[PDB]
Amino acid sequence: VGSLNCIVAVSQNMGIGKNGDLPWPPLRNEFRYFQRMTTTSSVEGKQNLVIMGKKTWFSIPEKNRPLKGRINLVLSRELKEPPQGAHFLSRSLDDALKLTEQPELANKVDMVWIVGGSSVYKEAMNHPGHLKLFVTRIMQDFESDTFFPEIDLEKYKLLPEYPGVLSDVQEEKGIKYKFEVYEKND
Numbered sequence: 001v002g003s004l005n006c007i008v009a010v011s012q013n014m015g016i017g018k019n020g021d022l023p024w025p026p027l028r029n030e031f032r033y034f035q036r037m038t039t040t041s042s043v044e045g046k047q048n049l050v051i052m053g054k055k056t057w058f059s060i061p062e063k064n065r066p067l068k069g070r071i072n073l074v075l076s077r078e079l080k081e082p083p084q085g086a087h088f089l090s091r092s093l094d095d096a097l098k099l100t101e102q103p104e105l106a107n108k109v110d111m112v113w114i115v116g117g118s119s120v121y122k123e124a125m126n127h128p129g130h131l132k133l134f135v136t137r138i139m140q141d142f143e144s145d146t147f148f149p150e151i152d153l154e155k156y157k158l159l160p161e162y163p164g165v166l167s168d169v170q171e172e173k174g175i176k177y178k179f180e181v182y183e184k185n186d
């Protein structure tokens with residue numbers, strides 16, 4: 001298996017969701033960037049794996065489930081099998097990463113992408129080893145009820161450039177945002 005990564009878009013007040021949707025209006029090209037980053041695999045004959053919590057899975061409209069061209073794994077202790085449209089179910093992040101090493105996936109998975117929500121990001125961000133965060137800073141406050149965990153900059157280094165990531169300020173629907181990549185290795 002290849003690298004472990006988290007990807008998120010977050011407002012200035014650290015918001016990532018409100019009432020199971022976006023705190024902000026849809027940002028079409030920001031979403032395109034999410035699709036591109038999570039779908040594109042460096043390794044021939046492999047797909048990337050996305051790992052998400054149960055609330056995040058059900059926040060994807062029923063017609064957009066699963067995220068196409070990626071292997072979709074949901075984290076839940078309540079569910080007894082993968083939800084309709086999902087491919088895998090694990091009871092913990094540790095278990096999901098272990099699964100990625102089993103016969104069924106060990107040869108099929110390139111990058112792994114944690115795509116929410118707050119508790120899955122927090123566990124991933126605190127997991128020892130090499131990990132990158134791809135963070136879109138939406139540069140306005142938006143009312144939220146779910147928040148991105150603290151990024152400890154003693155460990156996470158903001159990279160000065162990254163291939164395939166635009167470095168200038170973006171704007172859609174009057175909302176400015178910018179892309180960042182952070183890397184730790186501990």
Ligand SMILES: NC(=O)C1=CN([C@@H]2O[C@H](COP(=O)(O)OP(=O)(O)OC[C@H]3O[C@@H](n4cnc5c(N)ncnc54)[C@H](OP(=O)(O)O)[C@@H]3O)[C@@H](O)[C@H]2O)C=CC1
Pocket residue numbers: 007008009010015016017018019020021022052053054055056057059075076077078079090091092093115116117118119120123146
């Ligand atoms: N980039 C962005 O702005 C993103 C925004 N979002 C937003 O965030 C919100 C949803 O996120 P959030 O509320 O945090 O919820 P989660 O997706 O993380 O879902 C929480 C549920 O998933 C399960 N879960 C989470 N972590 C684990 C774990 N380690 N092991 C097993 N099960 C786990 C639990 O389910 P159970 O009870 O079944 O055990 C828990 O109740 C929405 O607003 C959505 O729009 C989501 C992703 C990205």
Ligand SMILES: COc1ccccc1/C(=C/c1coc2nc(N)nc(N)c12)C1CC1
Pocket residue numbers: 007008009021022030031034052056057059060061064115116135136
């Ligand atoms: C309601 O949100 C969606 C609806 C349909 C399909 C995918 C999504 C998702 C989006 C983003 C997750 O991390 C993200 N990170 C970035 N920078 N942007 C995003 N847009 C997501 C998350 C998985 C539920």
